[PDB]
Design an enzyme around this catalytic site. Structure first.
Site, PDB file in Angstrom:
ATOM      1  N   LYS A 136       0.836  -1.451   0.266  1.00  0.00           N
ATOM      2  CA  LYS A 136       0.299   0.150   0.056  1.00  0.00           C
ATOM      3  C   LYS A 136       0.694   1.357   0.239  1.00  0.00           C
ATOM      4  CE  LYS A 136      -4.419   1.823   1.198  1.00  0.00           C
ATOM      5  NZ  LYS A 136      -3.613   3.131   1.802  1.00  0.00           N
TER       6      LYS A 136
ATOM      7  N   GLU B 290      10.388  -5.951   3.192  1.00  0.00           N
ATOM      8  CA  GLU B 290      10.817  -7.080   2.777  1.00  0.00           C
ATOM      9  C   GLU B 290      10.180  -7.655   0.865  1.00  0.00           C
ATOM     10  OE1 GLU B 290       8.767  -6.783   5.936  1.00  0.00           O
ATOM     11  OE2 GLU B 290      10.574  -7.269   7.289  1.00  0.00           O
TER      12      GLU B 290
ATOM     13  N   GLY C 183      -6.772  -7.442   5.779  1.00  0.00           N
ATOM     14  CA  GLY C 183      -5.864  -8.564   4.610  1.00  0.00           C
ATOM     15  C   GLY C 183      -6.466  -9.661   4.914  1.00  0.00           C
ATOM     16  N   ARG C 184      -6.864 -10.268   5.915  1.00  0.00           N
ATOM     17  CA  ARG C 184      -7.721 -11.485   5.528  1.00  0.00           C
ATOM     18  C   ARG C 184      -9.004 -11.676   4.701  1.00  0.00           C
ATOM     19  NH1 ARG C 184      -6.933  -9.450  10.722  1.00  0.00           N
ATOM     20  NH2 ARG C 184      -8.306  -8.945  12.229  1.00  0.00           N
TER      21      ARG C 184
ATOM     22  N   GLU D 166      -6.856 -15.161  13.135  1.00  0.00           N
ATOM     23  CA  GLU D 166      -6.172 -13.648  13.048  1.00  0.00           C
ATOM     24  C   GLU D 166      -7.586 -12.555  13.695  1.00  0.00           C
ATOM     25  OE1 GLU D 166      -3.591 -10.320  11.320  1.00  0.00           O
ATOM     26  OE2 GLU D 166      -4.759 -12.106   9.731  1.00  0.00           O
TER      27      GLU D 166
ATOM     28  N   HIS E 227      -7.397 -41.145   5.900  1.00  0.00           N
ATOM     29  CA  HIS E 227      -5.971 -42.212   6.375  1.00  0.00           C
ATOM     30  C   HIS E 227      -5.108 -42.194   7.375  1.00  0.00           C
ATOM     31  CE1 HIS E 227      -3.285 -45.639   6.781  1.00  0.00           C
ATOM     32  NE2 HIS E 227      -3.572 -46.358   5.634  1.00  0.00           N
TER      33      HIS E 227
ATOM     34  N   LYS F 234       7.289  -9.224  16.595  1.00  0.00           N
ATOM     35  CA  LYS F 234       7.964  -7.941  15.737  1.00  0.00           C
ATOM     36  C   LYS F 234       9.299  -6.596  16.341  1.00  0.00           C
ATOM     37  CE  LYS F 234       4.678  -8.214  11.986  1.00  0.00           C
ATOM     38  NZ  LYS F 234       3.794  -7.277  10.817  1.00  0.00           N
TER      39      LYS F 234
HETATM   40  O1  LIG Z   1       1.188  -1.865   2.535  1.00  0.00           O
HETATM   41  P1  LIG Z   1       2.281  -2.373   2.757  1.00  0.00           P
HETATM   42  O2  LIG Z   1       2.821  -0.497   3.656  1.00  0.00           O
HETATM   43  O3  LIG Z   1       3.415  -2.394   2.298  1.00  0.00           O
HETATM   44  O4  LIG Z   1       1.615  -2.332   3.759  1.00  0.00           O
HETATM   45  C1  LIG Z   1       1.208  -3.581   3.818  1.00  0.00           C
HETATM   46  C2  LIG Z   1       1.146  -5.132   3.178  1.00  0.00           C
HETATM   47  O5  LIG Z   1       1.841  -5.954   4.068  1.00  0.00           O
HETATM   48  C3  LIG Z   1       1.326  -7.839   4.185  1.00  0.00           C
HETATM   49  O6  LIG Z   1       0.572  -8.091   5.284  1.00  0.00           O
HETATM   50  C4  LIG Z   1       2.463  -8.483   4.422  1.00  0.00           C
HETATM   51  O7  LIG Z   1       2.920  -8.651   2.487  1.00  0.00           O
HETATM   52  C5  LIG Z   1       0.347  -7.301   3.934  1.00  0.00           C
HETATM   53  O8  LIG Z   1      -0.645  -8.194   3.805  1.00  0.00           O
HETATM   54  C6  LIG Z   1      -0.342  -6.261   2.548  1.00  0.00           C
HETATM   55  O9  LIG Z   1      -0.691  -5.802   2.058  1.00  0.00           O
HETATM   56  O1  LIG Z   2      -0.244 -53.328   1.318  1.00  0.00           O
HETATM   57  P1  LIG Z   2      -2.171 -53.235   1.117  1.00  0.00           P
HETATM   58  O2  LIG Z   2      -2.350 -54.877   1.154  1.00  0.00           O
HETATM   59  O3  LIG Z   2      -1.474 -53.003  -0.218  1.00  0.00           O
HETATM   60  O4  LIG Z   2      -2.529 -51.915   1.537  1.00  0.00           O
HETATM   61  C1  LIG Z   2      -1.754 -51.480   2.756  1.00  0.00           C
HETATM   62  C2  LIG Z   2      -1.509 -49.966   1.960  1.00  0.00           C
HETATM   63  O5  LIG Z   2      -2.069 -49.275   1.641  1.00  0.00           O
HETATM   64  C3  LIG Z   2      -2.577 -47.908   2.653  1.00  0.00           C
HETATM   65  O6  LIG Z   2      -2.933 -47.569   3.819  1.00  0.00           O
HETATM   66  C4  LIG Z   2      -2.901 -46.634   1.665  1.00  0.00           C
HETATM   67  O7  LIG Z   2      -1.986 -47.153   0.074  1.00  0.00           O
HETATM   68  C5  LIG Z   2      -0.406 -47.420   2.854  1.00  0.00           C
HETATM   69  O8  LIG Z   2       0.278 -47.169   3.849  1.00  0.00           O
HETATM   70  C6  LIG Z   2      -0.374 -49.240   2.886  1.00  0.00           C
HETATM   71  O9  LIG Z   2       1.335 -49.292   2.542  1.00  0.00           O
END
Ligand SMILES: O=P(O)(O)OC[C@H]1O[C@](O)(CO)[C@@H](O)[C@@H]1O
Ligand SMILES: O=P(O)(O)OC[C@H]1O[C@](O)(CO)[C@@H](O)[C@@H]1O
Lengths: 556, 556
Positions: A210, A216, A276-277, A362, A393, A521
């Site tokens: 801005k 940075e 920002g968010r 935030e 898994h 900071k």
């Molecule tokens: O607008 P300045 O002065 O460059 O700093 C604000 C900027 O910095 C940030 O917090 C980080 O890049 C952005 O979200 C934001 O646009």
């Molecule tokens: O060994 P199988 O019979 O093919 O299934 C087990 C496999 O499946 C998984 O849970 C998923 O890909 C792995 O972690 C593992 O090696």
């Protein structure tokens, strides 16, 4: 305040009374529960909708009624109207909170400082329109006469997370030709990566600042500007006007953007009332609009605007973000649950949970109310999650058999990008089953039954049962969309944005400031100079001194 | 059991007594605190070390002593020795837990079923050695006479997360030539991506399945096998022996791997006592060993083995993973903290928190003890985190000013890959300052002082103070390594692996089973056939029925 409000006292009493009642008990009583504890929003285009099913919760009507009365008693709807009318609800910074303006499709005038901010929004939008159309058409050329095939966005935090999550989510609507890269690191590492990845003759750099002096980001930007200059010079191409063809600005500082070599017709502004968010909707979203183009960005903005309208006009009980916020409050503040899982069953939404961590924590990770003085109740929860299938898994083990109650938002789509294949049906069978699993459980008796049918030993059955039982009565919201288009996505973000507004209003906090980063900071600035070979510091506490001293004695 | 153990009762009483005492109070009392509440492990190579500083905690000596007595009373060290000697400590599955064998550099014999498992580990390791050496040297050729420049790993969960986190963490030690891709999705999407990204003549596919019939993975594998076959055929290249040059197996099913077209000399085996979330050390780690090569994988294994030795032989009070586990128990079980942040200040470790979510929550997210019967206390916490810098313009707001106490592991390196530049010093000034910030806070009085020096209005000072105050007394562990080499990384994973062992031992749970996924799988199987155009289901609860019915009436 809040500890002595009738409505909160009433909720305590109902938590004490009905809290242990199983989720499944509320279905056995009434056979239309699904209907009465769900809301559908018409997104007003293409059969699309956004639907929340909050039925799988430890909430009856007496509770649901107490929760709506809390929101009335706290005047959530009126606080929202004031925000929407440009009131300075960001108390501690003394400013408006007007991300709703950025997508105010209807152009309802909004007055900040004796001016209609929509003038400015629509002007920057129409500036973005013309610019992106010219990049995406091919007509904008870099210094050698070539069309642009890369966009590299420079900045951090809310200047990175939004653009990243949204361009990922919407790859199916994106020009596949122009690759998008997002640099957030202070070390030049990720910047150097992308410079040895792109042809500089076909690329534009977006600088997001801005004031347009911020140390940075302006550093990483000069990495690019310096590489551009070095590249032209070696190859006998003139530097005249060249930065103006390879660089644009997201900024207000007109003359400092111009000193940098950018054409100010290409300085895309945004305002202090855009946090920002809450910024992807603004010019910060330029990389999104490049990637998917103007019409799609307008669809995105519109889906948010449809959500704003729904949120402003719809009475609390039928009001989707309100009810979302209120079931979250039930769990966060009465069950005492510290966390909130967001689990999207669509690989395109893989970056949504991270985004929602920024937005939620935030905003609402606060310890004091506006009137000032400590909050008397738990505020924002810890948000986590990963995209569906994957997490399954992994940490689903814990959601299901662990000792923590965790509210889960399952988010999914009725339709799939790829019309032919069985992939999607299989995926959604898991999406429905997981929330079914969490609610119903599997009994001592049901497990016994299964293990008998497997012909388990008569003996290693009684000691095995408990490992395979599930308690159930674990909550889940099921959130569906017909299809994950730009507009559905915009409605999903806006929904969470207002869920956050609602929770923070009820708690009495300022959702829109961020003083929590300042301390780190300041202490870092004071440590940096102490980092030198052989230097011993004594001016901090022992741990900080020790650690610093270990660094100083062992580095290079 | 555990609720009636003297040692736990003792800890309750000390939590009640000293729990409110500020962290900073324990430094004011004794000036060597940093030293007495920190452990350094010599990694026995290259000046590398792993160091835990757990000083910034709500723990005094009386507490620290009570925590060590809990671990003795529960017989953590003896349970660990049995695991290390091939005892079947995975009670509910009736098997050994021998990830320590996979990195048993010293070849201490370990007997499962009347055989020394080290025979088999060392045989598969030496098989991997010869194979990877031949791929990385160029000598292995695909069907057309070309050397290999891509590796695509196929599988999910623990068959994906480990390899992903570790090859990312160790990019600086990796052959930059051969790109690594990791496909985890059920839909063929990510697979199709990588097939239109790679030249099939220079690529190998890793298939990760023990039976080598497992439906999802063997599907994505046939996507590749089918693309390979289609490609040779169109271009007039014979298919004879061709799958044997472009495919390898991580499996035991010798004849089914051979039916698939793979040369069984290229079937890399692993065993049932290698759990998924403990598998990167095994043949599952083949893509890692391809990427960084054999010598580096051995360094990785060794750093783990150094950690195993430290963990087995070192008395509890000086024992790094034990103390790690015990401060985590203090917070999880007495403070009642539901979560655990892992925050690595090194962009290469960006995938470590996700990995640690699988490891921790899938292991310890349990509701029952081995002897069976419900646990009387909180078990595993919810792990979250992102890589340092990034999270800092996000959810640090909440760690600092929110209403949840969250234990944070900050992990960092003394040295940087890039010797020249200021990037790294700046980064570590933040690493030390954040933990300093969390502990010390910033007072009503200190803030008043600052705001006076800024010449704030006399009036908008008293109501502003509280927004800018920090409470401090928030815990943090600082974990440092001299340098993030393969061996340091292996020590870091093993450290967490044993932290998990220790917590689950103390709670009485089986850390090494995963019955929590079964319910969802069974209910999904039963839903899949019900997903058809116009079909109404009535056989579930109302929410599940409604949701299913909405899907059936609105899809395609
Ligand atoms: O607008 P300045 O002065 O460059 O700093 C604000 C900027 O910095 C940030 O917090 C980080 O890049 C952005 O979200 C934001 O646009
Ligand atoms: O060994 P199988 O019979 O093919 O299934 C087990 C496999 O499946 C998984 O849970 C998923 O890909 C792995 O972690 C593992 O090696």
């Amino acid at each position: 305040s809040l500890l002595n409000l009738p409505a909160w006292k009433r909720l305590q009493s109902l938590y004490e009374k009905y809290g242990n009642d199983s989720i499944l008990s509320h279905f056995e009583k009434d056979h239309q529960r699904f209907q009465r504890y769900s809301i559908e929003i018409d997104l007003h285009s293409d059969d699309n909708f956004l639907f929340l099913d909050y039925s799988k919760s430890h909430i009856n009507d007496e509770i649901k009624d107490a929760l709506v009365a809390l929101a009335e008693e706290r005047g959530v709807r009126a606080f929202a109207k004031a925000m929407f009318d440009g009131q300075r609800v960001n108390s501690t910074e003394n400013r408006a909170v007007l991300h709703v303006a950025l997508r105010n499709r209807s152009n309802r005038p909004i007055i900040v400082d004796g001016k209609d901010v929509m003038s400015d929004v629509n002007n920057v939008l129409a500036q973005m329109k013309d610019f992106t159309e010219r990049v995406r058409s091919g007509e904008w050329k870099g210094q050698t006469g070539k069309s642009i095939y890369n966009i590299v966005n420079i900045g951090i935090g809310g200047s990175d997370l939004g653009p990243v999550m949204v361009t990922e989510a919407l790859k199916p609507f994106s020009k596949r030709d122009l690759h998008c890269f997002f640099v957030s690191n202070v070390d030049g590492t990720h910047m150097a990566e992308v410079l040895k990845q792109v042809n500089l003759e076909e690329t534009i750099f977006i600088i997001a600042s801005k004031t347009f002096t911020t140390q940075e980001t302006l550093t990483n930007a000069m990495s690019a500007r310096n590489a551009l200059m070095s590249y032209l010079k070696e190859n006998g191409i003139s530097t005249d006007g060249a930065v103006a063809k390879h660089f644009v600005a997201l900024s207000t500082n007109t003359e400092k953007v111009r000193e940098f070599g950018i054409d100010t017709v290409n300085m895309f502004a945004f305002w202090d009332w855009v946090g920002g968010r809450y910024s992807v909707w603004s010019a910060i979203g330029l990389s999104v609009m490049l990637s998917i183009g103007y019409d799609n960005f307008v669809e995105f903005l519109t889906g948010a605007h449809v959500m704003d309208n729904h949120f402003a006009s719809t009475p609390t009980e039928q009001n989707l973000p309100m009810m979302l916020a209120l079931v979250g409050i039930w769990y966060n503040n009465f069950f005492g649950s510290e966390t909130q899982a967001v689990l999207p069953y669509d690989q395109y939404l893989w970056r949504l949970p991270a985004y929602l961590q920024q937005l939620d924590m935030e905003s609402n990770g606060k310890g004091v109310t506006k009137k000032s003085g400590a909050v008397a109740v738990q505020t924002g929860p810890i948000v986590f999650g990963e995209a569906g299938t994957n997490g399954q898994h992994a940490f689903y083990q814990l959601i299901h058999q662990g000792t923590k109650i965790i509210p889960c938002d399952f988010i999914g789509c009725v339709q799939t990008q790829n019309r032919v294949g069985d992939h999607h049906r299989t995926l959604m069978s898991n999406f429905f089953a997981q929330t079914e699993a969490l609610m119903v459980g599997k009994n001592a008796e049901e497990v016994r039954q299964e293990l008998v049918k497997s012909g388990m030993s008569g003996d290693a059955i009684e000691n095995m049962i408990p490992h395979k039982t599930f308690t159930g009565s674990r909550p889940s919201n099921s959130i569906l969309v017909n299809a994950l288009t730009p507009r559905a996505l915009g409605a999903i973000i806006a929904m969470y944005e207002h869920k956050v507004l609602v929770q923070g209003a009820i708690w009495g906090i300022n959702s829109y400031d961020q003083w929590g980063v300042e301390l780190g900071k300041v202490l870092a600035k004071s440590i940096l100079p102490q980092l030198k070979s052989g230097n011993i510091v004594s001016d901090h506490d022992g741990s900080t001194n020790g650690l610093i001293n270990m660094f100083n004695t062992r580095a290079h």
